[PDB]
Ligand binder design. Structure first.
Ligand SMILES: [Zn+2]
Length: 57
């Protein structure tokens, strides 16, 4: 059942990293906007660590 959830960009809040990450529809729905978000919270295994380069658009 499609919930029509946007794929959104979020910025990592590790001050050493600050990289932007494009989330799946599912992860976009799950983000808790009252808590900090960090790269390791991304379930996309290609871009889920602060040591990984930012994706190109
Ligand atoms: Zn990061």
């Amino acid at each position: 059942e499609n919930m029509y959830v946007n794929k959104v960009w979020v910025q990592c809040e590790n001050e050493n990293c600050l990289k932007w990450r494009l989330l799946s529809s599912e992860d976009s729905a799950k983000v808790d906007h009252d808590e900090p978000w960090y790269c390791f919270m991304n379930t996309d295994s290609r871009y889920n660590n602060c040591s990984i380069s930012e994706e190109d658009r």
